Amino acid sequence: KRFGYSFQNFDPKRMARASARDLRISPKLAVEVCRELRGMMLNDALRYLDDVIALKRPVPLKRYNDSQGHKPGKGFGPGRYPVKVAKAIKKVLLNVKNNAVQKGLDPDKLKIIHIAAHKGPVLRGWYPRAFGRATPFNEQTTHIEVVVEEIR
Amino acid sequence: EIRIKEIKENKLIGRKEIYFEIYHPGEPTPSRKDVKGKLVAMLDLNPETTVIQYIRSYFGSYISKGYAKAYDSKERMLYIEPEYILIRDGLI
Amino acid sequence: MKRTGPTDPNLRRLIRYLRKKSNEYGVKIWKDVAWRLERPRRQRAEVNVSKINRYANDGEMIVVPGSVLGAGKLEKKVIVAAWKFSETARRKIIEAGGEAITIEELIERNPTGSGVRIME
Amino acid sequence: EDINKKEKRLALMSAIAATANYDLVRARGHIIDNVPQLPLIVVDDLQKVQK
Amino acid sequence: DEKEFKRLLRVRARLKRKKPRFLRQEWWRYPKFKNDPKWRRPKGIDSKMRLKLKGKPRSPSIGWSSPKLVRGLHPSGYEEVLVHNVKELEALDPKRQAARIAHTVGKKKRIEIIKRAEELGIKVLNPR
RNA sequence: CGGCCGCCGAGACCCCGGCGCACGGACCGAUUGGUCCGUGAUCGGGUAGGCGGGCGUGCCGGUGGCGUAGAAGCCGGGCC
RNA sequence: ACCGAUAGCGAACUAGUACCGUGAGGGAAAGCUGAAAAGCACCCCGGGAGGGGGGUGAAAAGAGCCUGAAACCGGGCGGCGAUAGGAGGGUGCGGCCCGAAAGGAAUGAGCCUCCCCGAAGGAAACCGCGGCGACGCGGGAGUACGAGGGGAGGGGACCGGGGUUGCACCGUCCGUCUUGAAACACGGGGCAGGGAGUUCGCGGCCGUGGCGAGGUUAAGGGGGUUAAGCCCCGUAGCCGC
RNA sequence: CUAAGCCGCCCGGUGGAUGGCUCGGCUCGGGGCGCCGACGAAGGGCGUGGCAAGCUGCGAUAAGCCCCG
Is the Cβ–Cβ distance between B70 and B16 less than 8 Å?
yes
- Output phi, psi for B74, to 5 deg: -65, -30
Is the Cβ–Cβ distance between C118 and C29 less than 8 Å?
yes
E120 at interface of B, judged by CB pairs closer than 8 A: no
B84 at interface of C, judged by CB pairs closer than 8 A: yes
Is the Cβ–Cβ distance between A16 and A99 less than 8 Å?
yes
Helix (H) or strand (E) holding C10: helix C9-25
Is the Cβ–Cβ distance between B52 and B35 less than 8 Å?
yes
Q: How far apart are CA E123 and CA E43, in angstroms?
A: 46
Q: DSSP secondary-structure letter at E124?
A: B
Listed residue (C79, C99, C82, C83) closest to C91, CA to CA: C99
Amino acid found at E27: W
CB spacing of D35 vs B12 below 8 angstroms: yes
Torsion on CA atoms E29, E30, E35, E38, rounded to nearest 10? -60
Resolution in A: 2.6
Q: How far apart are CA D51 and CA E66, in angstroms?
A: 64
Q: How far apart are CA C6 and CA E108, in angstroms?
A: 50
Is the Cβ–Cβ distance between E123 and E94 less than 8 Å?
yes
C1' of G57 to CA of A2 (Å): 16
Method: cryo-EM
Q: How far apart are CA C78 and CA C94, in angstroms?
A: 9
First to last CA, chain C: 25
C1' of G235 to CA of D8 (Å): 21
Listed residue (B33, B34, B22, B87) closest to B61, CA to CA: B22
Is the Cβ–Cβ distance between E97 and E125 less than 8 Å?
no
Three-state SS at C34:
helix
Three-state SS at B7:
strand
Neighbours of E44 (CB within 10 A): 10
Is the Cβ–Cβ distance between A63 and A31 less than 8 Å?
yes
Chain D nearest C-alpha distance from B7 (Å): 14
- Crossing angle of the two packed helices A83-103 and A27-37, in degrees rounded to 10: 50
Check if residue D15 sits with its Cβ under 7 angstroms from strand G.
Answer: no
Is the Cβ–Cβ distance between A148 and A12 less than 8 Å?
no
Give per-residue burial for A99-129: e unless 16+ CB within 10 Å, then b: bbeeeebeeeebebbbbbbeebeeeeeeeee
CB spacing of B23 vs E68 below 8 angstroms: no
Q: How far apart are CA C65 and CA C32, in angstroms?
A: 9
Bond before D39 cis per omega within 30 degrees: yes
Q: How far apart are CA A97 and CA A13, in angstroms?
A: 15
Chain E nearest C-alpha distance from B3 (Å): 9
Amino acid found at B78: L
Burial of B65 (0-12, 13-18, 19+ CB in 10 A): middle
Cβ-nearest to E93 among B3, B26, B60 = B3
Q: What's the angle, vertex CA E4, arms to CA E3 and CA E10, rounded to 5?
A: 95
Listed residue (A144, A111, A98, A145) closest to A14, CA to CA: A111
B82 at interface of E, judged by CB pairs closer than 8 A: no
Check if residue A116 sits with its Cβ under 7 angstroms from strand G.
Answer: yes
Neighbours of B23 (CB within 10 A): 15
